[PDB]
Amino acid sequence: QSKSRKIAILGYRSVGKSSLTIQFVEGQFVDSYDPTIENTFTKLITVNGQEYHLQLVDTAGQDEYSIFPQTYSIDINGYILVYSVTSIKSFEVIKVIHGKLLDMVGPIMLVGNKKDLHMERVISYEEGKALAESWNAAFLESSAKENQTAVDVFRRIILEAEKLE
């Protein structure tokens, strides 16, 4: 009866990929986490009464140039593309990442993290929303400081997978 899913969390460095995943997995907000390592977390969750075992591939992070390794496209059932609402460069980069990803595969969602930082925000909600609409993808904003927003992210990619499945 059980169901395994492997999810890759992509984005520019310091957007909060690790912080988000850890919020969800451990239920606590981390400051000290190293941006170099790739890590793979597990979690169990029930979505519409189906129990999933999630493998969450928190990538180191990438930029305009870096080429996709094969762990970014083999055996992946969902992608979470994260930018930070405080970094325009993170937002330009995530459009690049999304382009490369369609070519390197031939269920993706977009998350604008760090929404709690109202004095540093330089990307509007609607910019993110418009972009994901342009990809035909789900969009959420999140704060790694706020558990429900991180839970909502990872739940959402499963919900997205259930339709596209």
Ligand SMILES: Nc1nc2c(ncn2[C@@H]2O[C@H](COP(=O)(O)OP(=O)(O)O)[C@@H](O)[C@H]2O)c(=O)[nH]1
């Ligand atoms: N205020 C705030 N800080 C965050 C958020 N997400 C990540 N951070 C911080 O931003 C820095 C980079 O986070 P990290 O998860 O390492 O980004 P990664 O490099 O994409 O994994 C760390 O100091 C985090 O504590 C958020 O939603 N809100």
Ligand SMILES: [Mg+2]
């Ligand atoms: Mg990290």
